[PDB]
């Protein structure tokens, strides 16, 4: 319905969305609130049926399959600490749908 925030550790944040199938164009954006400022980490646009992704930033690693699409940031460090929002947009066909999850705070430390 909306994006699924995931976290990998023992250091990655992962948005997971299941496309309706009708939708042929999908954009997953990852933003971050830290120090009184919200910021785009990265975005990626997915052509369903062509199973092809277009990453708007090099920092992230987008991946596509038949139904489900995935956008990942890896190697998070102390300064990457902040609130992480998954955003999901159904571009084409209409209707346009937007799903913004409540953020999931990430705290990182490096001994």
């Amino acid at each position, epitope marked *: 319905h909306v994006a699924q925030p995931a976290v990998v550790l023992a250091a990655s944040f992962v948005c997971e969305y299941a496309s309706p199938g009708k939708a042929t164009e999908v954009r997953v954006t990852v*933003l971050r609130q830290a120090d009184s*400022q*919200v910021t785009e980490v990265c975005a990626a646009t997915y052509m369903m049926g062509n199973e092809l992704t277009f990453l708007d930033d090099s920092i992230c690693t987008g991946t596509s399959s038949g139904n489900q699409v995935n956008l990942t940031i890896q190697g998070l460090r102390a300064m990457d600490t902040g609130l992480y929002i998954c955003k999901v*947009e159904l571009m084409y066909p209409p209707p346009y749908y*937007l799903g*913004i999850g409540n953020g999931t705070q990430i705290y990182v430390i490096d001994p």
Partner: nanobody
Framework: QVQLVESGGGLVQPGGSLRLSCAASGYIYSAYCMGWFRQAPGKGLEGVAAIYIGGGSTYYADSVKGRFTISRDNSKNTLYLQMNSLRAEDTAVYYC?????????????????????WGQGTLVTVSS
């Protein structure tokens, strides 16, 4: 998933005052940025004001800064626009808008876009 419904728009005399209510029907929070837009009779969609919900930070269009003010109270979960000293150039259809977007672009005065959640609109006629 968020819904928006504007209200308070209507007939007013030029030089008058009016405040528009936008009742958000979802979960807004810190990361969200909410704003007001207007569509002039002939001209397309213009951004009048925006807020970074999290911060106090606000943006205002050159035409309306010092006359228009934009307000929010988490308690009610509703965005407000106070329009003070109206004009023949203010008369338009005022649309409520909300989206989680970079702060620099939210307050940058270039927000615009067809993306984000939008209200049904409310008609504001002010003239004669």
């Amino acid at each position: 998933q968020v819904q928006l419904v504007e209200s308070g728009g209507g007939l007013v005399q030029p030089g008058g005052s009016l405040r528009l209510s936008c009742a958000a029907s979802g979960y807004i929070y810190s990361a969200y940025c909410m704003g007001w837009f207007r569509q002039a009779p002939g001209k397309g969609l213009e951004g009048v004001a925006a807020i970074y919900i999290g911060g106090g930070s606000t943006y205002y269009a050159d035409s309306v800064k010092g006359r228009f003010t934009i307000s929010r109270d988490n308690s009610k979960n509703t965005l407000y626009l106070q329009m003070n000293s109206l004009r023949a150039e203010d008369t338009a259809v005022y649309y409520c808008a909300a989206d989680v977007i970079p702060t620099e672009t939210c307050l940058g005065g270039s927000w615009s876009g067809p993306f984000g959640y939008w209200g049904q609109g409310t008609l504001v006629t002010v003239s004669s």
